Design an enzyme around this catalytic site. Structure first.
Site, mmCIF file in Angstrom:
data_model
loop_
_atom_site.group_PDB
_atom_site.id
_atom_site.type_symbol
_atom_site.label_atom_id
_atom_site.label_comp_id
_atom_site.label_asym_id
_atom_site.label_seq_id
_atom_site.Cartn_x
_atom_site.Cartn_y
_atom_site.Cartn_z
ATOM 1 N N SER A 244 37.548 10.764 47.540
ATOM 2 C CA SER A 244 36.577 9.711 47.775
ATOM 3 C C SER A 244 35.392 10.360 48.476
ATOM 4 C CB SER A 244 37.157 8.579 48.591
ATOM 5 O OG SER A 244 37.820 9.046 49.762
ATOM 6 N N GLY B 50 45.834 1.826 47.613
ATOM 7 C CA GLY B 50 45.458 2.969 46.795
ATOM 8 C C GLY B 50 45.152 4.174 47.682
ATOM 9 N N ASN C 96 50.544 3.876 43.566
ATOM 10 C CA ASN C 96 51.292 3.702 42.333
ATOM 11 C C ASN C 96 51.902 5.029 41.880
ATOM 12 O OD1 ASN C 96 48.853 4.822 41.541
ATOM 13 N ND2 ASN C 96 48.512 3.411 39.832
ATOM 14 N N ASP D 138 52.357 -0.755 41.822
ATOM 15 C CA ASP D 138 51.114 -1.217 41.230
ATOM 16 C C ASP D 138 50.654 -2.421 42.049
ATOM 17 O OD1 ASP D 138 49.175 -2.546 39.641
ATOM 18 O OD2 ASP D 138 50.232 -2.150 37.748
ATOM 19 N N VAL D 139 49.490 -2.302 42.705
ATOM 20 C CA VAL D 139 49.062 -3.330 43.640
ATOM 21 C C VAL D 139 48.912 -4.672 42.924
ATOM 22 C CG1 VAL D 139 46.546 -2.974 43.514
ATOM 23 C CG2 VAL D 139 47.570 -3.818 45.639
ATOM 24 N N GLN E 237 52.543 10.999 45.080
ATOM 25 C CA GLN E 237 51.686 10.774 46.235
ATOM 26 C C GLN E 237 52.511 10.280 47.419
ATOM 27 O OE1 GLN E 237 48.406 8.363 44.782
ATOM 28 N NE2 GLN E 237 47.145 10.208 44.484
ATOM 29 N N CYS F 92 32.707 16.985 38.554
ATOM 30 C CA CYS F 92 31.969 17.345 39.757
ATOM 31 C C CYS F 92 30.487 17.591 39.463
ATOM 32 C CB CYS F 92 32.585 18.555 40.449
ATOM 33 S SG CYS F 92 34.220 18.212 41.145
HETATM 34 C C1 LIG Z 1 39.483 7.211 43.928
HETATM 35 S S1 LIG Z 1 41.178 7.219 44.478
HETATM 36 C C2 LIG Z 1 40.945 6.955 46.253
HETATM 37 C C3 LIG Z 1 42.237 7.364 46.950
HETATM 38 C C4 LIG Z 1 42.161 7.314 48.481
HETATM 39 N N1 LIG Z 1 41.870 5.934 48.967
HETATM 40 C C5 LIG Z 1 41.094 8.293 48.997
HETATM 41 O O1 LIG Z 1 40.092 7.801 49.556
HETATM 42 O O2 LIG Z 1 41.312 9.527 48.845
HETATM 43 C C6 LIG Z 1 41.757 5.564 43.999
HETATM 44 C C7 LIG Z 1 43.268 5.463 44.062
HETATM 45 O O3 LIG Z 1 43.720 4.167 43.598
HETATM 46 C C8 LIG Z 1 44.961 4.361 42.959
HETATM 47 N N2 LIG Z 1 45.271 3.202 42.129
HETATM 48 C C9 LIG Z 1 44.632 2.831 40.973
HETATM 49 N N3 LIG Z 1 45.121 1.742 40.434
HETATM 50 C C10 LIG Z 1 46.147 1.362 41.288
HETATM 51 C C11 LIG Z 1 47.057 0.287 41.255
HETATM 52 N N4 LIG Z 1 47.059 -0.651 40.309
HETATM 53 N N5 LIG Z 1 47.965 0.201 42.258
HETATM 54 C C12 LIG Z 1 47.949 1.142 43.214
HETATM 55 N N6 LIG Z 1 47.146 2.199 43.340
HETATM 56 C C13 LIG Z 1 46.253 2.258 42.338
HETATM 57 C C14 LIG Z 1 44.762 5.656 42.179
HETATM 58 O O4 LIG Z 1 45.985 6.224 41.764
HETATM 59 C C15 LIG Z 1 44.027 6.499 43.227
HETATM 60 O O5 LIG Z 1 44.912 7.220 44.073
HETATM 61 C C1 LIG Z 2 31.256 11.930 41.985
HETATM 62 O O1 LIG Z 2 31.324 10.511 42.043
HETATM 63 C C2 LIG Z 2 32.478 9.919 41.622
HETATM 64 C C3 LIG Z 2 32.422 9.318 40.352
HETATM 65 C C4 LIG Z 2 33.560 8.697 39.867
HETATM 66 C C5 LIG Z 2 34.750 8.659 40.620
HETATM 67 C C6 LIG Z 2 34.804 9.266 41.899
HETATM 68 C C7 LIG Z 2 33.642 9.890 42.390
HETATM 69 C C8 LIG Z 2 36.081 9.236 42.765
HETATM 70 C C9 LIG Z 2 36.324 10.512 43.614
HETATM 71 C C10 LIG Z 2 37.117 11.657 42.954
HETATM 72 C C11 LIG Z 2 38.362 11.188 42.186
HETATM 73 C C12 LIG Z 2 38.010 10.068 41.195
HETATM 74 C C13 LIG Z 2 37.347 8.878 41.923
HETATM 75 C C14 LIG Z 2 37.039 7.635 41.064
HETATM 76 C C15 LIG Z 2 35.948 7.961 40.020
HETATM 77 N N1 LIG Z 2 36.757 6.476 41.953
HETATM 78 C C16 LIG Z 2 36.389 5.280 41.216
HETATM 79 C C17 LIG Z 2 35.831 6.661 43.089
HETATM 80 C C18 LIG Z 2 35.915 8.045 43.752
#
Ligand SMILES: C[S@@+](CC[C@H](N)C(=O)[O-])C[C@H]1O[C@@H](n2cnc3c(N)ncnc32)[C@H](O)[C@@H]1O
Ligand SMILES: COc1ccc2c(c1)[C@]13CCCC[C@@H]1[C@H](C2)N(C)CC3
Ligand SMILES: C[S@@+](CC[C@H](N)C(=O)[O-])C[C@H]1O[C@@H](n2cnc3c(N)ncnc32)[C@H](O)[C@@H]1O
Ligand SMILES: COc1ccc2c(c1)[C@]13CCCC[C@@H]1[C@H](C2)N(C)CC3
Lengths: 338, 338
Positions: A79, A117, A141, A167-168, A145, A313
Site C-alpha cells: 500500500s 484485508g 482471505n 472472504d470479508v 498471509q 511499478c
Molecule cells: C492492496 S492490498 C493491502 C494490504 C494491506 N492492508 C497493506 O496495506 O499492505 C489489499 C488486500 O485485500 C485483500 N483482499 C481482497 N479481497 C478480499 C476479500 N474479499 N476478503 C479479504 N481480503 C481481501 C487482498 O488479498 C490484499 O491483501
Molecule cells: C502504484 O499504485 C498502485 C496501483 C494499483 C494498486 C496498488 C498501487 C496497490 C499496492 C501494491 C499491491 C497492489 C495494490 C492494489 C492495486 N490496491 C488496489 C491498492 C494498492
C-alpha cells in the site's frame, strides 16, 4: 503499434525504461481526458452516474514470502507509504505510514482493532507492538498471509494478535470492534454499499472506521482499458476487479456510517513507494529469479512474473507522479456508525 | 481608495457601471485567491476546517409588494432562475426553475409538500396549481409574505395551500411531509447540523428532502470582507448571516439524512437572473421611487434602498458570471431520511 506486438517486445525486455514510462504516461493522459468534464455541472453528472452504477452491483498461486521480502519493505507493506524526505527509505516510509494511520484512526491503548484485508500484517504488528493492551485482529482471505502474520507475532513476542481467515464479503460474526481499519482493500470490493453496511454491524456507537484508498482527486473509474491502444490496464489487472474511486466518492456511501474527517495524501508518496519497490526488485533481481524458479517451473515463467510486477511499478510511478502527485493520490476518511 | 470614500461616491451615483463592475469583480477575484489551495491535500484541509467550524456554531422594515413586483419577475422569485435561451424572460425563467425543482424533488400529485423559507410563494403556488391533489404548505418568518401568498392563492382559486408563520429554527411540530423543499434558505441558517436534524424529524421513511443553495464549486466561505479593501460584502449584508457552502459541503451533513442525488446549475443562470432584476428595476426606476417614498420618509432614504438593491444585482452578476459561471453557481441535493 499492435497490442500483441507491444506485449511481445515488453516480455522480451526490448522496451527500454524511458519508452515504457512514456507509453504508460500517455495511457494515463487519455484517462484524464476521459474523466475531466468542461463544467462542474457535467462533472457531477458524470460522477453521480458512476456512483449510481456502483449501487446496482451485487487463488492458486501466491508469491513466496522470500520473494516478497526481496521486493517490498521490511514489513512487506503493499500500500502507499509516506516519505518525509527524498532520502527516506522504504522501511522508514512503511513505519511513517503506519504511524499516520494510528493518528488519524485515533488508536488508543486498550482498544479492540480489526484490520480488513491486512495483507502481510505490517499494520497489525505495528499496533500490537505499540499498544500492548490493544487486541488486534487481522482479516485476510489468504492462508499464506495468515501463517506469515502468526509466525511474525510469535517471533516478536506479541500475545495480542489473532487472524481471521475469510472472504470479508462472506464473513458473518456478531463480534464488534472499537476500531476498524481498511487500508487499500475497498478498491477490490465488488459491492461497496453492502461492504460499508456489513462494517457498520461490526461497530458499536463508540467505534470508528478508517478507510484509505487509491483515488483520483476529481473522478472515479474502473481500472480497465478505455480503448484498444491500452495494453497496460489488462496486463496489470487481467480481471475487472479494481475500482479507483474519486477522493469524494465515499461521501455518497453514508447509508450506515457518518463521516467525521476526510484527507488526501499527495500522489508523490505512492510514486516514491512503487519506485522503492522497483529499485529493490532490480537490486535483488538475480536472487528473485532463483527464489521464483522452483514454484514456477520454468525460467520463462519467472521472467513473466517479474515483468508483470516490474511493469506495475513503472506504470504506478507514472500514474501517481502525474502533475506532481495532483491527479491520482490516496484518500482517507474517518467514520462513525450512523 | 478609502472605503468611506468609495461608499460616498457610490451613494451619490458617481461610480459608473463599468467601474462598479470592475471593482466588485476584483473583490471576488481576491476571494478566489483566498479559497483555492495549491494541492488537493491542502484544499481538503481547508474545506474540512470550515465544515468543522460550522458544527460548533449553536425585522421591522420590509419592501412593499408593489416595489417587489416592479423589480422581480411575475411570482417575485428571490432565487436563481433557469434560462434556456439568451432571450428567455425572467417570467419564463421563474417557471422553468419551478419545473426543474419539481422534477428533481420527484413531486407527484397527492403528496404533502413543505417549502421552507418560501418567500413570496412562487414555488408553493406553482406546485399547488400543477398538482391539485397535493397539499402544499409554505413556511416563512414574514407576516407580509404569508399574507401575500394567501391572497394569491385566493385569486388563483387554489384550495390546497396553507402557510406557517414561523422562525424555522424555533418551529416545533409532530407533522410530517412527503416532500420538503429548501430553496436558497439554508444559506441563512446559523446551525446547519441542527437544521438538517430538525428537517429529518418532519420526514417519514417515504419522504424526500430537496435543497438548493448558492455555492462555490471548490470551497466554502462566509459572505464577509476578507480585507479592508472590500467595501462590498458588508454593504450588501451588514450582518454576518450568509454562508456560501461549497458544492459538496452538505455531503458532510448526513448525520440524519442520506444523499440520493447531487447536481449543480452553472452560475450564468444566476447571473442572468440578477441581470434581469437589475434591468427591470432600471426600467421602472421612476415608479419604484414613487412606491418607496411613503414608507421610507425621504427621497434620500429611497435612493439608499435602491442603490443597495441595484448594487446587489451588479455585484451578483460579477460573482456568478465569473469564468463563464464556473466559480460561483447553484448546488442541489436530494436526500432521504437516515
Ligand atoms: C492492496 S492490498 C493491502 C494490504 C494491506 N492492508 C497493506 O496495506 O499492505 C489489499 C488486500 O485485500 C485483500 N483482499 C481482497 N479481497 C478480499 C476479500 N474479499 N476478503 C479479504 N481480503 C481481501 C487482498 O488479498 C490484499 O491483501
Ligand atoms: C502504484 O499504485 C498502485 C496501483 C494499483 C494498486 C496498488 C498501487 C496497490 C499496492 C501494491 C499491491 C497492489 C495494490 C492494489 C492495486 N490496491 C488496489 C491498492 C494498492
Ligand atoms: C433567498 S430567499 C428564497 C425565498 C424563496 N425560497 C425563493 O426561492 O424565492 C430565503 C428566504 O428564507 C427566509 N428565512 C430566513 N431565515 C428564516 C428563518 N429562520 N425561518 C424562516 N424563514 C427564514 C427569508 O426571509 C427568505 O424569504
Ligand atoms: C446574485 O447572487 C445572489 C447572492 C446572494 C444572495 C442571493 C443571490 C439571493 C437571491 C436574491 C435575494 C437574496 C438571496 C440571498 C443572498 N440568498 C442567500 C440566496 C439567493
Amino acid at each position: 503499434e499492435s497490442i500483441g506486438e507491444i506485449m511481445g517486445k515488453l516480455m522480451q525486455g526490448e522496451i527500454g525504461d524511458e519508452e515504457l514510462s512514456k507509453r504508460i504516461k500517455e495511457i494515463f493522459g487519455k484517462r484524464l481526458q476521459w474523466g475531466y468534464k468542461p463544467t462542474h455541472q457535467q462533472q457531477l453528472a458524470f460522477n453521480l452516474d458512476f456512483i449510481k452504477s456502483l449501487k446496482e452491483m451485487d487463488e492458486t498461486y501466491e508469491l513466496p514470502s522470500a520473494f516478497l521480502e526481496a521486493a517490498f519493505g521490511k514489513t512487506i507493506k503493499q500500500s502507499g507509504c509516506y516519505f518525509k524526505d527524498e532520502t527516506t527509505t522504504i522501511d522508514e516510509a512503511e513505519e511513517a505510514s503506519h504511524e499516520l494511520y494510528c493518528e488519524r484512526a485515533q488508536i488508543k491503548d486498550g482498544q479492540t482493532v480489526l484490520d480488513i484485508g491486512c495483507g502481510q500484517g505490517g499494520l497489525v504488528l505495528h499496533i500490537a507492538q505499540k499498544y500492548k493492551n490493544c487486541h488486534v485482529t487481522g482479516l485476510t482471505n489468504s492462508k499464506a498471509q495468515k501463517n506469515y502474520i502468526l509466525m511474525q507475532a510469535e517471533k516478536l513476542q506479541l500475545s495480542n494478535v489473532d487472524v481471521i481467515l475469510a472472504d470479508v464479503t462472506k464473513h458473518e460474526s456478531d463480534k464488534t470492534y472499537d476500531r476498524i481499519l481498511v487500508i487499500e482493500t475497498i478498491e477490490h470490493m465488488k459491492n461497496i454499499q453492502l461492504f460499508m453496511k456489513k462494517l457498520s454491524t461490526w461497530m458499536t456507537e463508540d467505534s470508528l472506521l478508517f478507510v484509505d484508498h487509491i483515488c483520483h482527486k476529481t473522478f472515479s473509474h474502473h481500472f480497465e482499458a478505455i480503448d484498444e491502444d491500452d495494453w497496460y490496464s489488462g496486463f496489470i489487472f487481467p480481471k475487472g476487479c479494481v475500482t479507483i474511486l474519486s477522493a469524494s466518492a465515499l461521501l455518497y456511501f453514508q447509508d450506515d456510517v457518518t463521516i467525521l474527517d476526510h484527507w488526501v495524501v499527495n500522489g508523490m508518496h505512492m510514486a516514491r513507494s512503487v519506485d522503492a519497490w522497483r529499485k529493490k526488485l532490480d537490486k535483488n533481481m538475480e536472487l528473485a529469479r532463483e527464489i521464483l524458479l522452483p514454484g514456477l517451473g520454468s525460467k520463462e515463467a519467472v521472467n513473466g512474473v517479474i515483468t508483470h510486477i516490474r511493469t506495475f511499478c513503472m506504470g504506478g510511478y507514472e500514474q501517481f507522479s502525474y502533475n506532481n502527485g495532483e491527479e491520482w493520490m490516496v484518500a482517507q476518511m474517518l467514520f462513525k456508525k450512523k
